[PDB]
Amino acid sequence: NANVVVRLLIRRPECFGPALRGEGGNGLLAAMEEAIKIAEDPSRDGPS
C-alpha cells in the first residue's frame, strides 16, 4: 500500500499542495510560516 500510494502521489504531484509542487512553489517551511501568518491575521483566516 505504501509503494502504491507513493507512486500515485508522485504521478500526480498536485496532491502536495501549492508548496511542494514546484514551478514556483515555495518550501515547506515557507508555506508553514505563511500559514501561521494567515492564521494570526484575520480577514485571511476567517470568512469576514
Next chain:
Amino acid sequence: EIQFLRTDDEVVLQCTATIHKEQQKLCLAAEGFGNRLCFLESTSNSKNVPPDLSICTFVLEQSLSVRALQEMLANHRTLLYGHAILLRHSYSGMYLCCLSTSRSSTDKLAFDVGLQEDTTGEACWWTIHPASKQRSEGEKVRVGDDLILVSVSSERYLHLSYGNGSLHVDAAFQQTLWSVAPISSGSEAAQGYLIGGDVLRLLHGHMDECLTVPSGEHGEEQRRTVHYEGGAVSVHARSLWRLETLRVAWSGSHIRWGQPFRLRHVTTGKYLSLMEDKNLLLMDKEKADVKSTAFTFRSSKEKLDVGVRKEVDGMGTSEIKYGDSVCYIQHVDTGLWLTYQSVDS
C-alpha cells in the same frame, strides 16, 4: 507490409513540437565529445538547413526483458513493448542515459538526459511502452509507431520541456510521445555499395587525385574554395566528405543513380555548393538551401534525364559501389557536370 524494429537497426528518436502554433519535427541529438548532455535538432526545414543526423542517430543494441535485466545485473531479436532497450549513440559510442544531475529549471524531481560510457547500471536502460490503444503490452514493436520511454533507474519519461526559452529533453514524470524512424537496417548488402550518410573521398584520376580544399595555410576564405589535389591529402582528413541524403527516414539506404544529396566537408563542417558566377564554393550550414547544395551521381554523362524515382522505404538496390563504379557528379538544379579547370601539389 509492416516491418518491425530489431536489436541492430539504426533509428532516430523524433518528437513533434508545436510552438508559434506551428508543428515542428525535432530529433534527439548528443555530441558526446565535450558535451554529454542531449539537445534537439529541428528537421522541419530540411530544405532551408540540413539536419545533423550523424549525431541525431542511435542504434538499438539489446531488447532483453526486465526480469533478465535485473537478474544479470544482479549476477537480431525483435523489440517487444515493455522490454528494456539499450540505445547507443552511433557517433560518440556512448549510450543514452538518465543523468543523476538535476539541471532542470525548478522541476525538482526531473533529471537530465545525456550520454554514458559504461553499460552497467539501470540508468542506460529504457523500457518501451505503447503510445495508444492500438498496441498492447508484450506485443512486438512496429515501424512508425509512437513510443513512451521509461528510465529504469529513475522511473521517469523522456519528456520534451517547453518551460525554458528553448526546448529541452529531460527525464520528468510527464510523458511525451516519441516517433521512431529507421535509418539503416541489419541487412547491409555486401561491402562497398555506397550508403547514405557515409564519409568518403572523391578521387578524380587513377587513384591520384582528391577533391579537397586549401588547408595548409589555414585561413577561412582559403578553406572556403574547392580544388583537386594529389599526394598525402588522400590520407589527411581535409579530403573527407559526408554524403547526406535529402530525406530523414531511411537516410542510411543505398544511394541510387540520380538520387539528390548534399556533400559536407567533414573537417570544415560546411556544405559544398554551386554559385554559377563563382563556380563551386563551400558555405555555412544556415545557407544550404537544397537548390544550391543538391548534387547527384550519374552513371553516364549523357543527358538521359531519368527524372525522379519513387522513394522506396528500405535499403533498396545497391547501384553505386565503392572504387569499381565510376560516377559523374552533376548539380541537381543547373545540370552542370563538375570538371577541372586544368590549370597549368
